[PDB]
Amino acid sequence: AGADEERAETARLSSFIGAIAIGDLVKSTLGPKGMDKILLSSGRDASLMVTNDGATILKNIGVDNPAAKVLVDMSRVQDDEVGDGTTSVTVLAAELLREAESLIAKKIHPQTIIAGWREATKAARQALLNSAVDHGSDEVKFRQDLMNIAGTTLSSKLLTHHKDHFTKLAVEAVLRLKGSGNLEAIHVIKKLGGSLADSYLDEGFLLDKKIGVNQPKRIENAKILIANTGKVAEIEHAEKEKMKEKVERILKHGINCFINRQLIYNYPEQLFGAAGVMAIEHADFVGVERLALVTGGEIASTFDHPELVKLGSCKLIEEVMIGEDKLIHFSGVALGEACTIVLRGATQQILDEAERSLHDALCVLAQTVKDSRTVYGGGCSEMLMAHAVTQLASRTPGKEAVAMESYAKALRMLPTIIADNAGYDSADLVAQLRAAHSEGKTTAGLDMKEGTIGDMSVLGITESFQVKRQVLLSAAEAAEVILRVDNIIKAAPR
Amino acid sequence: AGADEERAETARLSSFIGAIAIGDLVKSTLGPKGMDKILLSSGRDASLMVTNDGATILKNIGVDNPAAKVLVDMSRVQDDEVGDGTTSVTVLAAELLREAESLIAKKIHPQTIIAGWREATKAARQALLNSAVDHGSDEVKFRQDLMNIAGTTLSSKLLTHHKDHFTKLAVEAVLRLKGSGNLEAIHVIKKLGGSLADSYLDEGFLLDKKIGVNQPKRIENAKILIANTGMDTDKIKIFGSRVRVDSTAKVAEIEHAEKEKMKEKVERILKHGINCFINRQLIYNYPEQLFGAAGVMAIEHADFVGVERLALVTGGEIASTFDHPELVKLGSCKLIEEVMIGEDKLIHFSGVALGEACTIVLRGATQQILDEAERSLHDALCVLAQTVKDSRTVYGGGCSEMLMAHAVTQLASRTPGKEAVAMESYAKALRMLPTIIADNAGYDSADLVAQLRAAHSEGKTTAGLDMKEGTIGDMSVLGITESFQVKRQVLLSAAEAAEVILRVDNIIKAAPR
Amino acid sequence: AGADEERAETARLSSFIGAIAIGDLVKSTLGPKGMDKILLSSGRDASLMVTNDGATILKNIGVDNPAAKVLVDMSRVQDDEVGDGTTSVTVLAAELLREAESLIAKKIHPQTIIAGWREATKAARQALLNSAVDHGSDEVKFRQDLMNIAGTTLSSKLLTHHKDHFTKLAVEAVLRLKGSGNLEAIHVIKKLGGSLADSYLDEGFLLDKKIGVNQPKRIENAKILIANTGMDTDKIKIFGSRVRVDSTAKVAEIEHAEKEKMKEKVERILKHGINCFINRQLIYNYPEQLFGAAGVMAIEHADFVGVERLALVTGGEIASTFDHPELVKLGSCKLIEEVMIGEDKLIHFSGVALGEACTIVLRGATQQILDEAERSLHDALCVLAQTVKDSRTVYGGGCSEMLMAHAVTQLASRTPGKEAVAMESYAKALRMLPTIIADNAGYDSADLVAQLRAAHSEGKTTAGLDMKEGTIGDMSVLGITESFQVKRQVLLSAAEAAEVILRVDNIIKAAPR
Amino acid sequence: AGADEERAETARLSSFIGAIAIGDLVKSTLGPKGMDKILLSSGRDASLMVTNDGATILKNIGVDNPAAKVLVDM
Amino acid sequence: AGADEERAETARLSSFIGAIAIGDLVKSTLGPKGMDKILLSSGRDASLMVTNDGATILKNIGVDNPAAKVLVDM
């Protein structure tokens, strides 16, 4: 069908509506008492994705007629170099649209106004390296390593009652991660729960498959094999020969485990159990890719593949009881370049937040190593910057000022949101918060447990420095695309 | 009783909409180059009324269901003791409501947020206590009679191409109006004729009526007679019925009786020397022939409002039945004549010895734009009276508003907890006025706000918004000033009811029904 | 009888909806941080009446189909024996209905639950001589006359800027009022002029009518005349007609007859020395000329209600036909004059020998809030009259409510069978009042409930809810107290009204007494 | 401050339309080859009025809501 | 079959409308302070393309009934 005629004010309006609908949903996602969102779609989606991470669910789908899919896409690039903390970039971009009504009031030309975004970009950078912060994050760091940003990032997530402990664990993972490679080979999965620790850290790669109930429970001094490839009587006999080749080569090596990214033939299965060797059927390729760098890998060919052409690391491979369920552990990698992170939880399918909380979590502290720079958490950064930015609008010659001042007041909502969900009155909170920040103590912040304000450093909360520099540059520009575009050329069968 | 149900959120919203709708119409009105709004209504008024005075049009009309009429009514009290200058008070109150949307995000206690009105008590302090206003305004005064505050009121008005001169004329009117004798008897009308002056100053009161084609053109040492009761005769309270009589002989006396009414009017009118008669209603035909021969000019259906002012003017009289002439009536005697003005014919009453009452006649092109002068003039009469004895003023063109805004921002953060949140919101309220003044001048509002703040911050209270310039300049050179009371009264009204109830800042919302 | 078919749960629902709808609107009203109210109507109401006094607005209108008007009607009965302080009785009755939802799960006999209210009679009785209160209220009094409860009634009202001063004035009025008769002859009129004091106390009665432009301005040793029959003479309900006269000559006699009515009025008016004449209805024109020369001030179409109070004031008189002068009329003599009060002119009657009847005049800033003062005075007068006779009052600010709640909690588990479930629920009802009082204050209600209970439990009766502070404080310094009978009657009344709601099949409209 | 309202650009159009309508009717009137115009309207006029002079015809009638009559009077 | 009927002067309008529709999107783009636009579409398109070049975006698509594609082609 052909239709959907919109121009000037109406076209702008479609942009306006997309921003307002998203902001309300992302609005309670910022701060300690964030709300759990669960979202499902038919087909290949699967089942359980319950999303507390605003960036993850938005990126995955593009369900309806209004245009906003592209703005959403932009947040992930931010995510790769830093992302989260709490999802605030979309909210700030959305609130900018409200002033668009005032743009018609200005009744001249919208283009003159958008130059403010460039200026906003400068505003972003002049809100970065001036108006100091923590100056910590020395490296490794026994106490400031975490119990920090993750606690605040986790704050938006309900599981904080036992999860805040989990959060502390995540920086240990980054300490090993830092070095020779980059942000690579990190795999983490939730395993519901039933322990105070709520997580065990694996010295190596995590896997979840089983050949069958029969077979040896444990393997030691394990060699790992990964394979790319999966007179009538003599034909039957020939099958025995495949069995024979597999066993003869296997015993000399001492093979303790076999993993293959595809269907496995039944005959060899009987052999592995008697030998004392555990095999994996249809293991995910991605897990293997991570594993090859870790174990020194090998060359995956035909059955010539064992012995020297393949390298097998030998610390400990076992199936262990994790709180309740069984999960396979590949561990003790000599290289140390790549590692695996394991976490658990209370279990209300809100625990699944950890599946994507973690996606934000993974990038933030890995980043922390690289930055050697961080900022105070609990919204400490936001109030300080807000006090400084209000002055800044007049500081600029013009054009820059109008957009910069509106931007400045935007920061006010974040402190409000952090304590709003906290179970305390936002109004009392916002006023008291500013007095401590304006005073000159950067350590002062939102003490959510307290219900008032306190020393953020004592609590132990800091945010990656990159989250603040990139987010500010990214937010203004992500916001600019929807306001600057009046009339999006299309055709909408739907 | 009945209809229109609103509570909490929805009710707050109705207040919200009323403030935003009024702000846009008043928005074009403020500052040295404003815009004209022209209104036409049905069933109770004659035609197109155009007002550049926000106060004048608002008092007259309650157009629709949303609430705004009560806020509007209050501005009039402001006029009686100060008023006008430029209409800025309504704008400050409206912008207060915008912050309310950000309050729902907080979702708990607007009242806790509200810490600001006590903080805004500060506005009563900071806005109109720092900066030395004005002082002397001696008396009569040669040069300082005008070319200052009246001009600013008018500059915001479009007619300034020629009306700046008109404003200058108005203080001359106030000089005669100063002293002892009350603020009364000032009459002004506009004439459809173009001239450079665009206005004429009369020595007395102007009226537009004539006896008829016959009668003397001009009278001197005139005696003025005003009667409450009409000249018409016949019915009386009891008819006496319509009679028939015993022969043609007695019907004659009835006609004769009519002659007697004619007789009384001339016989004692002559002793007085009566030169002019003014009656507010229908006039009987018989006297009309008599007046022409006598040399007396009478006015048929004279407007009552003109009459009451006229009595103050000539010392007045007691108006009753035909006994009213001679001593019971007092008549001033300089010159009464009918004089053609530009094109139309008008009758001029002048030379009143008492001097308390005077009249101003405006002249113009014949455009709707011309009707603008009527709106500006009303504004001017009120402005000058207040300026002369208030002995206090503030720098105009938004100079006052930017300064206070800088000061109020400091107040936020300085106060510790609870107190800070509303005080900043109150503070941003000053920012929209700078925007309102720039937008109507055709200059980019965004660019203007940034450059404006830097000059005010520096400390020159004189510097403000110059619309002709498109940027910022020295307000004092322009001669743009606002009276102290206009600014002072509004801040208390905004922070009056606001204080004590929900005792603090971010008001109103609905209550019962 | 029988038309509206609603049964059991649906019938209950109509009662249920009426209580919740009224509770939210009245909720703002109860504490020192209350709010004013705006109302809109069509159908002979002509203007918006601002009323935060819950009793006044509820009585005036029966807005919709669900029943509540009879429940509403009853609160006035409370009003003559006290009525105010702050509204609250309606809220408590409403709060009981919401837990009825848990009673459908219970699914038994609504009436069995009702035994709680008979139990509540015990609560009513033991809430008496349990609270611990103030004594005193001697008579007249030195410094406890006010700055107390009237101020609290006012605090819930938006007017408490200028107004709290007005309240202070009201006790002076009550001091003259004491004796046997309780509330006769008390009148209040709003003034539109501006004064910081905002009120003037008249020693007599205030009207607002004038004879005409002429007549002496001031009268001394005044004699007062009141006539039932009008000065006008002619038609009656049997018509003279519009008569027939034979030759015009005889129409003259009718004119002469008019003169005779004038003659009677002047001849005996003079002997008395008549200084003022008050007539409730239309006045005939002929006497009007007479009164001016005589030196007598008369009032045309005086309102009858004003006259009746005035009669008690003067000493009374027998009103009949023109024979009415001298002894059949009793005139009080002090001072009768028309005095301009800063703006709109009024006539002031003063110096009453009786002293029982008095008039209070209010002045203000000039707004909707000013009309509010009329609303506030009505509440102020009633409280003080009650305070002297009761000789007992209780601590305000919800101090009374928390103390009783602590005591009632013990009672529920201790009592036998059906009594236990009933008594426990009644006890929790008291808890909501602390929450409502705190919420309008500007401070957190949740925090407030816990802190409140700890101080009351301890044994300090003085301690209560402090709304401006947001925490618990000492009520006695504040000056908020409630009349002792307000609490006695509410306790007994609340239980009886709630009890009948579940029982009755349908609700609809008013008829009892 | 309201009545029949149109704002800025729409408001401009009402004045804009009145001028274009008058210009075409009057253009044929001018010079050696100008032509006579006749008007007919309902109620309170009669029937055919012909006015060569542009001023005489405009003054006589205020045909519709859009503004132009004040311009015409001058 | 038959829905929209156009002749001579209105035909000019359909042609007129195409020029105004294109001009608003293009004008923002012109000069040192221009803007970027994103188009979704469906079928034989990998993902939304965002084009600053007026020429590139117009060549790639022929969205509707009014005639403008040929003007674009040149």
PDB file of all heavy atoms in Angstrom, chain A residues 393-410:
ATOM      1  N   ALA A 393      27.462  28.190  30.691  1.00  0.00           N
ATOM      2  CA  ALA A 393      26.646  28.677  29.585  1.00  0.00           C
ATOM      3  C   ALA A 393      26.948  30.161  29.306  1.00  0.00           C
ATOM      4  O   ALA A 393      27.169  30.531  28.166  1.00  0.00           O
ATOM      5  CB  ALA A 393      25.171  28.505  29.914  1.00  0.00           C
ATOM      6  N   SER A 394      27.002  31.006  30.328  1.00  0.00           N
ATOM      7  CA  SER A 394      27.357  32.420  30.105  1.00  0.00           C
ATOM      8  C   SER A 394      28.842  32.579  29.717  1.00  0.00           C
ATOM      9  O   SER A 394      29.237  33.586  29.129  1.00  0.00           O
ATOM     10  CB  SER A 394      27.044  33.273  31.335  1.00  0.00           C
ATOM     11  OG  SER A 394      27.921  32.980  32.403  1.00  0.00           O
ATOM     12  N   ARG A 395      29.668  31.603  30.121  1.00  0.00           N
ATOM     13  CA  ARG A 395      31.110  31.639  29.841  1.00  0.00           C
ATOM     14  C   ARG A 395      31.369  31.656  28.319  1.00  0.00           C
ATOM     15  O   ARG A 395      32.288  32.322  27.839  1.00  0.00           O
ATOM     16  CB  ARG A 395      31.794  30.436  30.531  1.00  0.00           C
ATOM     17  CG  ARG A 395      33.320  30.474  30.527  1.00  0.00           C
ATOM     18  CD  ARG A 395      33.899  29.248  31.228  1.00  0.00           C
ATOM     19  NE  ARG A 395      35.347  29.342  31.462  1.00  0.00           N
ATOM     20  CZ  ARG A 395      36.281  29.383  30.514  1.00  0.00           C
ATOM     21  NH1 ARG A 395      35.954  29.345  29.230  1.00  0.00           N
ATOM     22  NH2 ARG A 395      37.559  29.464  30.862  1.00  0.00           N
ATOM     23  N   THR A 396      30.582  30.854  27.586  1.00  0.00           N
ATOM     24  CA  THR A 396      30.641  30.799  26.111  1.00  0.00           C
ATOM     25  C   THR A 396      30.085  32.101  25.467  1.00  0.00           C
ATOM     26  O   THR A 396      29.202  32.736  26.041  1.00  0.00           O
ATOM     27  CB  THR A 396      29.875  29.565  25.603  1.00  0.00           C
ATOM     28  OG1 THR A 396      28.489  29.675  25.928  1.00  0.00           O
ATOM     29  CG2 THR A 396      30.437  28.291  26.227  1.00  0.00           C
ATOM     30  N   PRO A 397      30.581  32.515  24.265  1.00  0.00           N
ATOM     31  CA  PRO A 397      30.124  33.774  23.592  1.00  0.00           C
ATOM     32  C   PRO A 397      28.630  33.867  23.225  1.00  0.00           C
ATOM     33  O   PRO A 397      28.029  34.943  23.247  1.00  0.00           O
ATOM     34  CB  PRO A 397      30.929  33.783  22.290  1.00  0.00           C
ATOM     35  CG  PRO A 397      31.370  32.376  22.078  1.00  0.00           C
ATOM     36  CD  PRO A 397      31.559  31.783  23.443  1.00  0.00           C
ATOM     37  N   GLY A 398      28.040  32.724  22.939  1.00  0.00           N
ATOM     38  CA  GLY A 398      26.649  32.666  22.516  1.00  0.00           C
ATOM     39  C   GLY A 398      26.390  31.428  21.696  1.00  0.00           C
ATOM     40  O   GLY A 398      27.351  30.763  21.305  1.00  0.00           O
ATOM     41  N   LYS A 399      25.117  31.138  21.387  1.00  0.00           N
ATOM     42  CA  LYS A 399      24.746  29.917  20.638  1.00  0.00           C
ATOM     43  C   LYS A 399      24.989  28.686  21.521  1.00  0.00           C
ATOM     44  O   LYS A 399      24.085  27.901  21.811  1.00  0.00           O
ATOM     45  CB  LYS A 399      25.587  29.797  19.355  1.00  0.00           C
ATOM     46  CG  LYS A 399      25.457  28.463  18.639  1.00  0.00           C
ATOM     47  CD  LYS A 399      26.318  28.430  17.386  1.00  0.00           C
ATOM     48  CE  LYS A 399      25.696  29.224  16.252  1.00  0.00           C
ATOM     49  NZ  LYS A 399      24.224  29.031  16.185  1.00  0.00           N
ATOM     50  N   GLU A 400      26.238  28.581  21.963  1.00  0.00           N
ATOM     51  CA  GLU A 400      26.726  27.509  22.809  1.00  0.00           C
ATOM     52  C   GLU A 400      26.002  27.507  24.156  1.00  0.00           C
ATOM     53  O   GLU A 400      25.630  26.466  24.688  1.00  0.00           O
ATOM     54  CB  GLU A 400      28.211  27.794  23.110  1.00  0.00           C
ATOM     55  CG  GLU A 400      29.108  27.745  21.888  1.00  0.00           C
ATOM     56  CD  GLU A 400      30.575  28.024  22.166  1.00  0.00           C
ATOM     57  OE1 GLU A 400      30.962  28.080  23.341  1.00  0.00           O
ATOM     58  OE2 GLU A 400      31.338  28.194  21.193  1.00  0.00           O
ATOM     59  N   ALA A 401      25.782  28.715  24.662  1.00  0.00           N
ATOM     60  CA  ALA A 401      25.166  28.950  25.970  1.00  0.00           C
ATOM     61  C   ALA A 401      23.759  28.401  26.151  1.00  0.00           C
ATOM     62  O   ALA A 401      23.451  27.804  27.178  1.00  0.00           O
ATOM     63  CB  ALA A 401      25.124  30.438  26.222  1.00  0.00           C
ATOM     64  N   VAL A 402      22.898  28.635  25.177  1.00  0.00           N
ATOM     65  CA  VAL A 402      21.504  28.208  25.281  1.00  0.00           C
ATOM     66  C   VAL A 402      21.404  26.696  25.441  1.00  0.00           C
ATOM     67  O   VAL A 402      20.704  26.186  26.313  1.00  0.00           O
ATOM     68  CB  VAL A 402      20.717  28.620  24.043  1.00  0.00           C
ATOM     69  CG1 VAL A 402      19.225  28.385  24.235  1.00  0.00           C
ATOM     70  CG2 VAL A 402      21.038  30.042  23.684  1.00  0.00           C
ATOM     71  N   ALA A 403      22.104  25.985  24.563  1.00  0.00           N
ATOM     72  CA  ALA A 403      22.108  24.532  24.604  1.00  0.00           C
ATOM     73  C   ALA A 403      22.858  24.003  25.825  1.00  0.00           C
ATOM     74  O   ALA A 403      22.440  23.025  26.441  1.00  0.00           O
ATOM     75  CB  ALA A 403      22.733  23.988  23.325  1.00  0.00           C
ATOM     76  N   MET A 404      23.972  24.641  26.159  1.00  0.00           N
ATOM     77  CA  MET A 404      24.780  24.228  27.304  1.00  0.00           C
ATOM     78  C   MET A 404      24.026  24.327  28.645  1.00  0.00           C
ATOM     79  O   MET A 404      24.153  23.450  29.494  1.00  0.00           O
ATOM     80  CB  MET A 404      26.085  25.028  27.321  1.00  0.00           C
ATOM     81  CG  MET A 404      27.089  24.553  28.352  1.00  0.00           C
ATOM     82  SD  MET A 404      28.612  25.507  28.321  1.00  0.00           S
ATOM     83  CE  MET A 404      29.768  24.255  28.861  1.00  0.00           C
ATOM     84  N   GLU A 405      23.256  25.406  28.834  1.00  0.00           N
ATOM     85  CA  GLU A 405      22.478  25.595  30.074  1.00  0.00           C
ATOM     86  C   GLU A 405      21.343  24.567  30.224  1.00  0.00           C
ATOM     87  O   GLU A 405      21.078  24.076  31.324  1.00  0.00           O
ATOM     88  CB  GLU A 405      21.919  27.015  30.141  1.00  0.00           C
ATOM     89  CG  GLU A 405      20.821  27.290  29.132  1.00  0.00           C
ATOM     90  CD  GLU A 405      20.397  28.739  29.106  1.00  0.00           C
ATOM     91  OE1 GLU A 405      19.617  29.150  29.991  1.00  0.00           O
ATOM     92  OE2 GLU A 405      20.845  29.465  28.197  1.00  0.00           O
ATOM     93  N   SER A 406      20.663  24.255  29.115  1.00  0.00           N
ATOM     94  CA  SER A 406      19.582  23.265  29.140  1.00  0.00           C
ATOM     95  C   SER A 406      20.170  21.902  29.474  1.00  0.00           C
ATOM     96  O   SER A 406      19.579  21.092  30.187  1.00  0.00           O
ATOM     97  CB  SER A 406      18.843  23.236  27.795  1.00  0.00           C
ATOM     98  OG  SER A 406      19.677  22.758  26.751  1.00  0.00           O
ATOM     99  N   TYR A 407      21.329  21.663  28.889  1.00  0.00           N
ATOM    100  CA  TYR A 407      22.108  20.463  29.118  1.00  0.00           C
ATOM    101  C   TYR A 407      22.494  20.337  30.604  1.00  0.00           C
ATOM    102  O   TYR A 407      22.485  19.254  31.180  1.00  0.00           O
ATOM    103  CB  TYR A 407      23.345  20.512  28.222  1.00  0.00           C
ATOM    104  CG  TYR A 407      24.254  19.325  28.350  1.00  0.00           C
ATOM    105  CD1 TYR A 407      24.072  18.218  27.534  1.00  0.00           C
ATOM    106  CD2 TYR A 407      25.290  19.307  29.271  1.00  0.00           C
ATOM    107  CE1 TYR A 407      24.898  17.125  27.633  1.00  0.00           C
ATOM    108  CE2 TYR A 407      26.122  18.216  29.374  1.00  0.00           C
ATOM    109  CZ  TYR A 407      25.919  17.130  28.550  1.00  0.00           C
ATOM    110  OH  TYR A 407      26.742  16.048  28.642  1.00  0.00           O
ATOM    111  N   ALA A 408      22.872  21.474  31.192  1.00  0.00           N
ATOM    112  CA  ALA A 408      23.294  21.552  32.599  1.00  0.00           C
ATOM    113  C   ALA A 408      22.215  21.105  33.591  1.00  0.00           C
ATOM    114  O   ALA A 408      22.492  20.376  34.541  1.00  0.00           O
ATOM    115  CB  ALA A 408      23.686  22.989  32.905  1.00  0.00           C
ATOM    116  N   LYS A 409      20.989  21.555  33.364  1.00  0.00           N
ATOM    117  CA  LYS A 409      19.854  21.208  34.226  1.00  0.00           C
ATOM    118  C   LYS A 409      19.453  19.734  34.082  1.00  0.00           C
ATOM    119  O   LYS A 409      18.786  19.171  34.949  1.00  0.00           O
ATOM    120  CB  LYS A 409      18.694  22.163  33.971  1.00  0.00           C
ATOM    121  CG  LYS A 409      18.012  22.000  32.629  1.00  0.00           C
ATOM    122  CD  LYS A 409      17.221  23.248  32.268  1.00  0.00           C
ATOM    123  CE  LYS A 409      16.312  23.682  33.405  1.00  0.00           C
ATOM    124  NZ  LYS A 409      16.947  24.721  34.265  1.00  0.00           N
ATOM    125  N   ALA A 410      19.861  19.135  32.972  1.00  0.00           N
ATOM    126  CA  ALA A 410      19.612  17.721  32.675  1.00  0.00           C
ATOM    127  C   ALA A 410      20.244  16.836  33.749  1.00  0.00           C
ATOM    128  O   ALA A 410      19.697  15.804  34.141  1.00  0.00           O
ATOM    129  CB  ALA A 410      20.157  17.368  31.304  1.00  0.00           C
TER     130      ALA A 410
END
